[PDB]
Automatic annotation (TrEMBL), chain A:
<dbReference type="GO" id="GO:0046872">
    <property type="term" value="F:metal ion binding"/>
</dbReference>
<dbReference type="InterPro" id="IPR011249">
    <property type="entry name" value="Metalloenz_LuxS/M16"/>
</dbReference>
<dbReference type="InterPro" id="IPR007863">
    <property type="entry name" value="Peptidase_M16_C"/>
</dbReference>
<dbReference type="GO" id="GO:0005739">
    <property type="term" value="C:mitochondrion"/>
</dbReference>
<dbReference type="InterPro" id="IPR050361">
    <property type="entry name" value="MPP/UQCRC_Complex"/>
</dbReference>
<keyword id="KW-0496">Mitochondrion</keyword>
<comment type="function">
    <text>Substrate recognition and binding subunit of the essential mitochondrial processing protease (MPP), which cleaves the mitochondrial sequence off newly imported precursors proteins.</text>
</comment>
TrEMBL record, chain B:
<keyword id="KW-0472">Membrane</keyword>
<keyword id="KW-0496">Mitochondrion</keyword>
<comment type="function">
    <text>Component of the ubiquinol-cytochrome c oxidoreductase, a multisubunit transmembrane complex that is part of the mitochondrial electron transport chain which drives oxidative phosphorylation.</text>
</comment>
<dbReference type="GO" id="GO:0005743">
    <property type="term" value="C:mitochondrial inner membrane"/>
</dbReference>
<dbReference type="GO" id="GO:0045275">
    <property type="term" value="C:respiratory chain complex III"/>
</dbReference>
<keyword id="KW-0999">Mitochondrion inner membrane</keyword>
<keyword id="KW-0813">Transport</keyword>
TrEMBL record, chain C:
<keyword id="KW-0645">Protease</keyword>
<dbReference type="GO" id="GO:0004222">
    <property type="term" value="F:metalloendopeptidase activity"/>
</dbReference>
<feature type="binding site">
    <location>
        <position position="152"/>
    </location>
    <ligand>
        <name>Zn(2+) 2</name>
    </ligand>
</feature>
<comment type="similarity">
    <text>Belongs to the peptidase M16 family.</text>
</comment>
<keyword id="KW-0496">Mitochondrion</keyword>
<feature type="binding site">
    <location>
        <position position="72"/>
    </location>
    <ligand>
        <name>Zn(2+) 1</name>
    </ligand>
</feature>
<dbReference type="GO" id="GO:0005739">
    <property type="term" value="C:mitochondrion"/>
</dbReference>
């Protein structure tokens, strides 16, 4: 028969404490890095959590997309973890489901990430499944063909958010080069798409010096010993279409949008390599976040801002920081006016309480983004791929050491560059395109 | 059985080549191939293998079947210049069909069914 | 056949011994204040962020018909100021911590929790006790919140799954406390004031019905000192208003019934089929969790549904019978719900219903050892994924203390899960599903959903 | 002022330039001068069958002259390759100048 013991009661006296306690490591674990003979960087951090995460970061994304291979990052996101040279799609799916592990693919503006999160007891299975799924992938004709409807409906679902569209237009307008290529493309772009287009894109982005294997919650020496015969990547390092900030102004028309969106952005000079500039950009993003609901059913009310969402992006060599504010279609000029006046209000000076608030907000976001094992592995991989090393302790120390003079001088030097204006919806109250660029002066 | 089954395979290969020679002589007059002799209604794996194909291959297969059925109605064969060009053993389906059948054999050892059924009309 | 790629992995399911995970798992330390309030903490060895809050053994079940929806209005009003902090002072004090305040009101459980860093535990304790014990409950803010709630009542602004599950509770537990909705009817919202809120707080937010749980970067004894300083004014039990006595006085009742909510122009059809489940204390609730894992779930954004190890997911993904679905297992103090919810179209309603009913009834006869082993491994792995997050560990501590009266060690939960075999799954499904009444709820385009006699006949097999 | 349009599958790129015709349809002379300017901007008028006038940058040129009540809008719309849009703008400015 089954167990008849009530759940508030403890179970039977045969309940063996087979796990022995002790010992926790006496020191905080740190990221170790060691390259391979092929040139693959392996960067892992040990963690007391019982979940091991393994993420493979490949340079590419929308930046590596040609006009021939447009939209290939989204299709690679959907079509990943399918049949390989050693496993069919059925066998690979059953192997992932057997150990209770989850897989994901994620395409960024300048990278593509593949990862498998699993129990610490099944880390070799996760590593071998991820290695086979990225290295030996057979992008068959019918499996790629049968997924284009899912890709197109997901793209149409993503473009229904006006924030995603405004982000795409902002990235195109601000940049010249690979960083201006659209990531979340229109569904009509993937119409004449085949598996040879995907194979061409994958061949263009794959090289052993463009690949970072990141991990969380595993021994580094064992990981390198087991990833030695798997990541034997061969390929040619394609030239990177490097990008420079140029700014400008563009508008996108939506005839049945009940809200008009206004986007403003500035270049975060230095990119992810500069820790101090990245910390200052995070603090400016926290400062511009006027309406952040920290309590349930908060009732903040602005006179013109229906919604305000600031952002701060960090890429290899450059980035953006700014704000996207919505509003009524008849109130867009006042939305532009308030968005403009807010940054001179920030450039004039920040108080010590406001600086402490923004520093605490940015530190909270930074230490919340790495609190989980998959988030920590993703942060390690993104940092090693962008700059060659990961240390969020230096980022936190730079956030803590920021004074009001540093932020004031940063915003003053930031307002001395080119702005960027992007508007969504029906523009029946767009005042002047030239004058709003000269308001900062 | 293993002592005699080592050399029972070349005799199988010789009989198979003779069979394919005779049938391909029969098939070439209608302009057909050996893979055109497989019916999606008769086998659900062939129906699955046929939708995994690029559209031009399916258009060519339909064209060959239409030509053969027209020839069968007219009680004719292909003319000599067309008949000398016929390639009855140029496969377009055997790789895809072999993959489909291997997948079905793999699913059956784990108790899973095939993810398709027969073609049902009406 | 690659040698480096085809080692250590194979698709054949086998039992997995999860014992070496438990050595590194933290332990929980529980203390009890003199008023009955429990403080329980679990210290993660290298953590920076901490979550903490108060879990109260109260909800919309323990209301009356006159004050239904007082508990949901409490989380609308409790953040609008206190006797020591105003609105702006509370806002700047929360945003100085670099964190969030959140509240959740259920039917049998209420939570008021915060997510902070490890250096702001004491400020979070102080602000939580100040919110919970010293709130203004201003009439002007009540009048401002009532207009918003009434406008969203009259616009009919609700999630579709929430509407379906509320209808399913109201028809399954009719003439029972669990049949009420959390938000409450229009009349009670329109005629609510400060005194009902005050009386609900004084009656139900007592000592032994509340648990202070924290997880992450937190010290136990320091939190005990802060909790004794802050929550010491919480009153104790009156013997006539204990949770067990209230449960005995007004028990739950399950009636087999049908309800649908038909709309003239609706694109989607959402339906749920539920059986009478198990309570928290029922020893067969663990095989119900294994069965809920066996049925699984699916949405059309996944392209590998046809390769799933679950037969219901296989049928729905292969035949395209629904857009999304998920099996559920709800547990309560004395009863529960068990079944499948899904979103489909009007032309696929009968086929989806037959798939649900045939997959549920098959578990009373045909259970394979491989599917049981796979679902047990998936259950234990999902239990380990909750251990990765501080919020889920804190919620687990509070819920387990409130509904079991203790904190179950992970070794005991693993031993209970590991004791479930195919025979136990067959016996539990035979007890709970086979030839039993069920409750069916639907909404939207439901003209082609079958009636109760169609569902009732497909709980048993005449072929056997 | 100035604006923009985002078109996902436009094989070409279109640029419009316009000015105000003062007086609208009410003034005979200003409308006549605007019509003369519209004809002066006619670069490729199809006066013969199958004639192939080749421009360096343009793919199509289409001027106009609308005369409403009190005000008008005389101008020109020119197409071009997606990679040569700045050249289209430069050529249009050069033509008006
Ligand atoms: Zn509400």
């Amino acid at each position: 028969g089954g167990g008849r013991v009530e759940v508030p009661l403890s179970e039977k006296l045969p309940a063996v404490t087979e796990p022995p306690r002790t010992s926790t490591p006496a020191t905080k674990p740190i990221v170790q890095t060691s390259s391979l003979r092929s040139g693959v960087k392996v960067a892992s951090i040990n963690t007391v959590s019982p979940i091991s995460s393994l993420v493979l970061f490949v340079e590419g994304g929308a930046a590596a997309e040609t006009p021939a291979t447009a939209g290939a990052s989204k299709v690679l996101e959907v079509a990943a973890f399918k049949a390989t040279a050693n496993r069919s799609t059925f066998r690979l799916t059953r192997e992932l489901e057997k150990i209770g592990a989850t897989s994901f693919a994620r395409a960024g503006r300048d990278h593509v990430a593949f990862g498998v999160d699993a129990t610490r007891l099944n880390q070799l299975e996760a590593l071998e499944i991820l290695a086979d799924a990225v290295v030996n992938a057979r992008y068959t004709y019918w499996e790629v063909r049968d997924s284009l409807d899912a890709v197109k409906e997901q793209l149409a679902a993503q473009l229904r958010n006006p924030l995603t569209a405004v982000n795409e237009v902002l990235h195109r307008t601000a940049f010249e080069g690979g960083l201006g290529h659209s990531l979340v493309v229109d569904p009509s772009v993937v119409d004449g798409f085949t598996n040879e287009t995907l194979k061409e894109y994958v061949h263009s982005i794959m090289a052993p010096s463009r690949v970072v294997l990141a991990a969380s919650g595993v021994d580094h020496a064992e990981l390198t010993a087991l990833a030695t015969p798997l990541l034997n990547l061969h390929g040619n390092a394609h030239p990177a279409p490097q990008s420079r900030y140029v700014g400008g102004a563009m508008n996108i028309i939506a005839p049945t949008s009940s809200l008009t969106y206004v986007g403003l952005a500035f270049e975060a000079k230095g990119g992810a390599g500069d820790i101090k500039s990245s910390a200052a950009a995070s603090v400016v993003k926290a400062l511009l976040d006027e309406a952040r609901p920290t309590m349930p059913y908060q009732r903040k009310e602005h006179e013109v801002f229906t919604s305000v969402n600031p952002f701060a992006f960090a890429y290899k060599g450059t980035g953006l920081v700014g704000v996207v504010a919505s509003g009524a279609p008849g109130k867009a000029g006042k939305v532009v006016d308030a968005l403009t006046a807010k940054v001179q209000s920030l450039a004039k000076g920040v108080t010590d309480v406001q600086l402490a608030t923004a520093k605490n907000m940015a530190l909270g976001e930074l230490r919340a983004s790495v609190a989980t094992a998959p988030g920590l592995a993703a942060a390690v991989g993104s940092s090693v791929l962008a700059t060659g090393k990961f240390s969020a302790n230096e980022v936190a120390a730079a956030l803590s050491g920021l004074t009001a003079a540093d932020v004031t001088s940063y915003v003053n030097a930031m307002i001395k560059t080119a702005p960027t204006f992007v508007t969504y919806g029906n523009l029946s109250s767009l005042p002047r395109v030239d004058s709003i660029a000269k308001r900062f002066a | 059985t293993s002592l005699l089954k080592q050399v029972a395979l070349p005799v199988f290969n010789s009989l198979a080549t003779t069979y394919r020679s005779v049938v391909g002589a029969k098939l070439a007059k209608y302009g057909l191939r050996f893979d055109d002799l497989q019916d999606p209604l008769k086998d659900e794996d062939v129906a699955e293998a046929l939708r995994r194909l690029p559209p031009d291959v399916v258009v060519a297969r339909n064209c060959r079947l239409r030509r053969a059925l027209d020839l069968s109605c007219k009680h004719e064969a292909l003319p000599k210049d067309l008949l000398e060009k016929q390639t009855p053993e140029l496969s377009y389906l055997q790789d895809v069909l072999n993959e489909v059948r291997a997948e079905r054999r793999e699913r059956a050892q784990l108790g899973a069914p095939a993810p398709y059924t027969r073609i049902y009309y009406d | 056949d690659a040698n480096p790629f085809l080692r250590f992995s194979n698709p054949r399911p086998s039992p997995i011994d999860h014992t070496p995970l438990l050595s590194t798992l933290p332990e929980t330390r529980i203390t009890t204040l003199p008023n009955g309030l429990r403080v329980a903490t679990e210290a993660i060895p290298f953590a920076e962020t901490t979550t903490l809050g108060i879990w109260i053994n109260s909800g919309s079940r323990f209301e009356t018909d006159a004050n239904n929806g007082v508990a949901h209005f409490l989380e609308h009003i409790l953040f609008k100021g206190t006797k020591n902090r105003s609105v702006k002072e509370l806002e700047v004090e929360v945003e100085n911590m670099g964190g969030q305040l959140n509240a959740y009101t259920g039917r049998e459980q209420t939570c008021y929790y915060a997510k902070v860093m490890g250096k702001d535990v004491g400020k979070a304790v102080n602000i939580l006790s100040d919110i919970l014990l010293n709130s203004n409950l201003d009439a002007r803010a009540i009048d401002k919140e009532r207009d918003v709630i009434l406008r969203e009542m009259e616009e009919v602004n609700k999630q579709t799954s929430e509407l379906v599950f509320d209808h399913l509770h109201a028809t399954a537990f009719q003439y029972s406390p669990l049949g009420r909705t959390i938000l409450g009817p229009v009349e009670n919202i329109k005629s609510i004031n400060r005194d009902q809120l005050v009386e609900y707080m004084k009656t139900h937010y007592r000592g032994p019905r509340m648990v202070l749980a924290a997880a992450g970067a937190v010290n136990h004894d320091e939190l005990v000192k802060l909790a004794s300083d802050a929550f010491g004014s919480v009153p104790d039990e009156d013997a006539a208003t204990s949770v067990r006595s209230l449960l005995v006085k007004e028990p739950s009742r399950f009636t087999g019934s049908y309800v649908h909510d038909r709309f003239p122009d609706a694109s989607e059809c959402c339906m749920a089929v539920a059986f009478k489940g198990a309570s928290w204390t029922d020893p067969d609730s663990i095989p119900l969790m294994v069965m809920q894992t066996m049925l699984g779930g699916w949405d059309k954004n996944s392209t590998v549904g046809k390769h799933s190890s679950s037969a219901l997911v296989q049928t729905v993904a292969t035949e395209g019978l629904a857009d999304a679905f998920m099996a559920f297992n709800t547990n309560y103090h004395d009863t529960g719900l068990f079944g499948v919810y899904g979103v489909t179209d009007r032309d696929r309603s009968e086929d989806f219903a037959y798939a649900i009913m045939s997959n549920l009834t098959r578990m009373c006869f045909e259970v394979r050892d491989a599917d049981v082993a796979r679902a047990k491994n998936q259950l234990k792995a999902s239990l380990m994924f909750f251990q990765d997050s501080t919020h889920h560990v804190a919620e687990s501590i509070g819920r387990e203390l409130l509904v079991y009266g203790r904190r179950i060690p992970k070794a005991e939960m693993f031993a209970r899960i590991d004791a479930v075999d195919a025979n136990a799954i067959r016996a539990v499904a035979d007890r709970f599903i086979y030839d039993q009444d069920m409750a069916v709820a639907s909404a939207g385009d439901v003209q082609f959903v079958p009636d109760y006699n169609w569902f009732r006949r497909r709980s048993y097999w005449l072929r056997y």
